[PDB]
């Protein structure tokens, strides 16, 4: 016997609620699954709609309704309204609204310029591809008015794939399952992070180079601590807003470069005051700026 051809349509209303630490995101949408069963008799020989709690009564009476699992859903999805549409020719359409937490690999190392791929993976829970196979998949997403107010900028239409997953721990040709894969590409909106985080940080790090224009070893060294303290004061401003991650981002590296630059100046200032009154090396008012930008370009090689 041939497998049941199941046609799938996924409507995505919203993708939001990224949890950087857990690498998860929420997806609100509809899922539609259509297949052809045996013909049946319906009231007035017209399509029959069966909603929510009444679905259970048809299943208990024999109506085949396979469970399709979201491979990458975290916990049970929040399923709202759902209906069946039973045609007399045998066609069956299952339609349900869902809100689920979904996971996938997410790399935030180029924050705030990172680019992510939001994925949904769908697969029958119990029926292999000799019994149930996905014949096609179509995706429909939100028509965006303007994205300037949005946190993520969608890039391209939804990508789809239909593949076969072969499991080695189910022992003839009965260990392959049909899997749908949907992917939404998006880029982070960096405007806020550019103006309120990166820019003020550059000013703070640049302003620490002003110590070299002070005409007293006393002034230069003392003010270096006020700068060190300014980078720290800025540290918990970024830590309180930027996402929690198990690795360093771009901004983080800037912050670390800031710590070193100020700490370097402390050494040079002290080194200048005991090397020979070396106001010539104290004229490193250009070396320090140049050295930082050089190492700064190398930082963003990823």
């Amino acid at each position: 016997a041939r497998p049941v051809d199941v046609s799938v349509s996924i409507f995505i209303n919203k993708i939001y609620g990224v949890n950087t630490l857990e690498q998860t995101y929420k997806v609100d949408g509809y899922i539609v699954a259509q297949w052809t069963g045996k013909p049946r008799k319906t009231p007035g020989d017209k399509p029959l709609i069966v909603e929510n709690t009444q679905i259970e009564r048809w299943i208990n009476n024999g109506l085949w309704v396979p469970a399709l699992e979201f491979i990458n859903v975290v916990g049970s999805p929040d399923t709202g309204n759902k209906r069946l549409m039973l045609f007399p020719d045998g066609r069956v359409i299952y339609n349900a609204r869902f809100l689920g937490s979904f996971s996938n690999d997410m790399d935030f190392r180029l924050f705030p310029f990172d680019r992510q791929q939001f994925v949904l993976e769908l697969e029958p829970f119990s029926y292999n591809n000799q019994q149930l196979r996905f014949s096609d998949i179509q995706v429909y997403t939100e028509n965006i008015d303007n994205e300037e107010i949005d946190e993520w900028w969608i890039r391209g239409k939804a990508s789809t794939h239909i593949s076969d997953i072969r499991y080695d721990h189910l022992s003839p040709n009965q260990n392959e399952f049909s899997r749908i894969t949907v992917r939404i590409d998006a880029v982070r909106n960096p405007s806020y992070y550019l103006w309120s985080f990166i820019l003020p940080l550059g000013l703070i790090i640049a302003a620490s180079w002003s110590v070299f224009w002070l005409e007293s070893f006393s002034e230069r060294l003392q003010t270096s601590f006020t700068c060190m303290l300014t980078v720290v004061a800025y540290a918990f401003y970024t830590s309180n807003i930027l996402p929690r991650l198990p690795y360093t981002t771009v901004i983080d590296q800037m912050i670390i470069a800031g710590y070193g630059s100020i700490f370097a100046a402390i050494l040079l200032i002290i080194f200048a005051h005991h090397r020979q009154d070396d106001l010539l090396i104290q004229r490193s008012r250009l070396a320090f700026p140049l050295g930082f930008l050089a190492i700064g370009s190398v930082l963003v090689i990823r």
Partner: nanobody
């Protein structure tokens, strides 16, 4: 760097064993996958490992005819291709997944090899 081999001419219904040698910073062969590209068509997925242990992802045209295996000792993967048909004629490439969140997406693979031609009459 990746290098393929094992292609050639085979009669419809025959078999071939493609090999992909991997060299460099590659902790495991899991990141490697097979692709193919016929003249004029786009590079299409063929096979790579599954996320969870014991699973492998195959393109829908494979239909159980191909089998991806790995030799972590030699740091390699093999594509055993059986029941080949004229539709399978293409250049088969070996790629290495460099991040992203889609095992089946060529965009997420780099370090491609020269490719090895497979031709079925």
């Amino acid at each position: 760097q990746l290098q393929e081999s094992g292609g050639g001419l085979v009669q419809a219904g025959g078999s071939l064993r493609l090999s992909c040698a991997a060299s460099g910073r590659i902790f495991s062969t899991n990141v490697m996958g097979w692709f193919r590209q016929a003249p004029g068509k786009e590079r299409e997925f063929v096979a790579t490992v599954g996320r969870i242990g014991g699973s492998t992802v195959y393109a829908d045209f494979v239909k159980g005819r191909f089998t991806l295996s790995r030799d972590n000792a030699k740091n390699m993967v093999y594509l055993q291709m059986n029941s080949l048909k004229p539709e399978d004629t293409a250049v088969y490439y070996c790629g290495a997944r460099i991040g992203g969140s889609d095992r089946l997406a060529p965009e997420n693979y780099g370090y491609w090899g020269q490719g090895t031609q497979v031709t079925v009459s």
